[PDB]
Amino acid sequence: GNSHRGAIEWEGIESG
Amino acid sequence: HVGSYGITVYQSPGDIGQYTFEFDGDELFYVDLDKKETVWMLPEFAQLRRFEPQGGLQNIATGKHNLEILTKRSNSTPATNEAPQATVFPKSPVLLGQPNTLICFVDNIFPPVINITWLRNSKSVTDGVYETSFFVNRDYSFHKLSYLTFIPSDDDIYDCKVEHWGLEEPVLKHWEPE
Amino acid sequence: GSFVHQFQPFCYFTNGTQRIRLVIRYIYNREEYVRFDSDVGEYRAVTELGRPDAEYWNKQYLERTRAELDTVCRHNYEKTETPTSLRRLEQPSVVISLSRTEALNHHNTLVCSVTDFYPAKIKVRWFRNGQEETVGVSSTQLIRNGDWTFQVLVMLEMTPRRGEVYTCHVEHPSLTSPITVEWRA
Amino acid sequence: KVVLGKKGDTVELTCTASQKKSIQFHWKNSNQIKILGNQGSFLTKGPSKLNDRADSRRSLWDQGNFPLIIKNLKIEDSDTYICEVEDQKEEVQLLVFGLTANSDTHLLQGQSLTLTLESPPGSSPSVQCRSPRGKNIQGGKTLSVSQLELQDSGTWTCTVLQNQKKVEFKIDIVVLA
């Protein structure tokens, strides 16, 4: 039925 | 208005995480990470709108992931413990015999680990207690509220006990009717 | 001891969905390291800890993030907040009580307890014999009970004399007509 | 007690009473307008010119402290304030000043610098500034440095002194060839 979504936390880069 | 769709907090050690939706400062729901369900504060809302908990789980998994990466980035800078400050006030006007709810509002919580309990006549209470998730604050500390159902009377006095790492000893916030 | 990571999204709405701003904060313990602000248009490093992120995210997730202003903010507001949060109306309870035990001609304070209401917009006025009181009125901040209702206490510094009528006057969206409560000495 | 503040900064006026406990108190101004006080265990602010800029620290009430905090100061917040805890009164007079540089920006060698001190109509002091390399010009409500030299490019320090008290402003001036 009524579908609720949220924000999407993004991943972060590593090393370098 | 202000909607915070996916506040995601993760903490280590302990693998402590919380995922909530807030609207205009109030708690829409939190996702029970263990049971994997969306728990709405106002149950009627779950009849007019819905959120798939997976989104919650997923965002938490990412929170966990970014915590390791960020912990390493700061060269393992631990979180500073703050001293939580508690305030007790009744939901409704106090009337002898009329059912009411005592509210313990605890602000400036950091880190997000705490025990908020109730004492009635210096003894711990179990029944009639409910608690919210941690709400974000502009300064990045949190606030939380605990609830105790009760009937105002002549003999009963109360305390909200707050136990936190930033407190040398559990603090008691006393409250008694008039 | 421990380590904390916070991810805090914010959809700021003005005049309904006429103006939507999306702010996303990434925080380590209590330090915000990288932030996306739709007014700015791209991710930004708040502190050194955020450079490894800003750089990359602006290449792979910029448009995805910007689109949330519609896919999440507007979508949630129009489709889920609309039939729930924005339709909530809870009428305020109003009751007056005296601070100190009564004794005519002696200074005292009337307390108007306006409670259990939602939303926050409210107007509470004190009247003494039909005239609105101003200077002697004091108030608490708007108190959020945390259960989707607020409360506020408005006090009036006064001296109860015979024949006087003190009225606490409350106006709120959940009410067609104001709620008034009188207190006579 | 005399407290001095700087325009646009925040001050904290103190109020210590006895019986360490959130008991009853309020702060009013000279016209007896209550600025803030405690209702029950709550903070209440009535309608006054400072309503959105005042506040206190509630956690300290249990220790017998009832500060009045004022932010974004205006010379017109200068005034005498009174704290009353139960039956204790405590007068604090706040004086607000403002040191401004009427020389806008871009200052060229040989140019004159003019500063002016803003002060409470009720009471006035003696100001005394210092260039980044020596000379201490001092005056009253208006100061002036007839002609500058590349050497004053820097950050000066003016001193306002009222009662045995004193505040200090430090402005950075840029003289260019």
Closest-CA residue in chain B for A10?
B62
CB distance B91–C145 less than 8 Å? yes
- Interior/surface letters D39-77, b for 16+ CB within 10 angstroms, e for the rest: bbebbbbbebebeeebbbebebbeebbbbbebeebeeeb
Distance, CA of B110 to CA of C4 (rounded, Å): 9
**Phi, psi of D156, deg, nearest 5:** -90, 170
CB distance D59–B85 less than 8 Å? yes
CB distance D41–B89 less than 8 Å? yes
Elucidation technique: X-ray
Structure-token pair, residue B37: 């369900």
Q: Which of A3, A8, A9 to substitute to test the interface with B, most B CBs within 10 Å?
A: A9
Distance, CA of B88 to CA of C96 (rounded, Å): 21
Question: D85 with D66: CB under 8 angstroms?
Answer: yes
Of residues D5, C71, C27, the one with CA closest to residue B7: C27
Of residues D95, D89, D104, D57, the one with CA closest to residue D76: D95
- For chain C, residues classed under CATH 3.10.320.10 are 1-87
**CB atoms near residue B42 (< 10 Å):** 17
Question: D15 with D68: CB under 8 angstroms?
Answer: yes
How many CB pairs lie under 8 A apart between chains B and C? 154
Beta-bridged to residue B27, according to DSSP, are B22
Question: Which chains contact C through at least 3 pairs of Cβ atoms less than 8 Å apart?
Answer: A, B, D
| Radius of gyration from C-alpha coordinates of chain A | 14
CA distance B50 to chain C (A): 8
Q: Is B54 exposed, middle or buried (0-12, 13-18, 19+ CB in 10 A)?
A: exposed
CA separation (Å) from B7 to B26, B117, C40, D66? 13, 25, 21, 35
Q: Would you call the peptide bond into B111 cis, given omega within 30 degrees of 0 as the criterion?
A: yes
Distance, CA of B156 to CA of B158 (rounded, Å): 7
Please state which CATH class domain C88-185 belongs to. mainly beta
Domains of chain D: residue spans and CATH: 1-97 (2.60.40.10), 98-172 (2.60.40.10)
Question: C45 with C54: CB under 8 angstroms?
Answer: yes
The size of chain C, in residues, is 185
CB distance C29–B77 less than 8 Å? yes
Domains of chain B: residue spans and CATH: 3-74 (3.10.320.10), 85-175 (2.60.40.10)
DSSP class of C23: E
**CB atoms near residue D91 (< 10 Å):** 11
- Please report the residues numbered 1 through 16 in chain A whose beta carbons come closer than 8 angstroms to any beta carbon of chain C: 2, 4-10, 12-14, 16
- For chain C, residues classed under CATH 2.60.40.10 are 88-185
Give the resolution to one decimal, in Å: 4.3
CB distance B88–D59 less than 8 Å? no
Q: Is D70 helix (H, G, I), strand (E, B) or coil?
A: strand
Distance, CA of D132 to CA of D149 (rounded, Å): 11
Of residues C38, C2, C3, the one with CA closest to residue C22: C38
Of residues C178, C162, C177, the one with CA closest to residue C129: C162
Q: Is D133 exposed, middle or buried (0-12, 13-18, 19+ CB in 10 A)?
A: exposed
| Radius of gyration from C-alpha coordinates of chain B | 18
Q: Which residues of D touch B87 (CB under 8 A)?
A: 41-42, 58
Of residues C20, C32, C26, the one with CA closest to residue C74: C20
Look at strands B50-51 and A3-4 and give their pairing.
Answer: parallel
Picking from B50, B55, B63, the nearest residue to A2 by CB comes out as: B50
Q: Does B88 touch chain D (CB under 8 A)?
A: yes
Q: Which residues of D touch B88 (CB under 8 A)?
A: 41
* SS3 letters across chain B: CEEEEEEEEEEECCCEEEEEEEECCEEEEEEECCCCEEEECCHHHHHCCEECHHHHHHHHHHHHHHHHHHHHHHCCCCCCCCCCEEEEEECCCCCCCCCEEEEEEEEEECCCCCEEEEEECCEECCCCEEECCCEECCCCCEEEEEEEEECCCCCCCEEEEEECCCCCCCEEEEECCC
Fold held by C1-87: 3.10.320
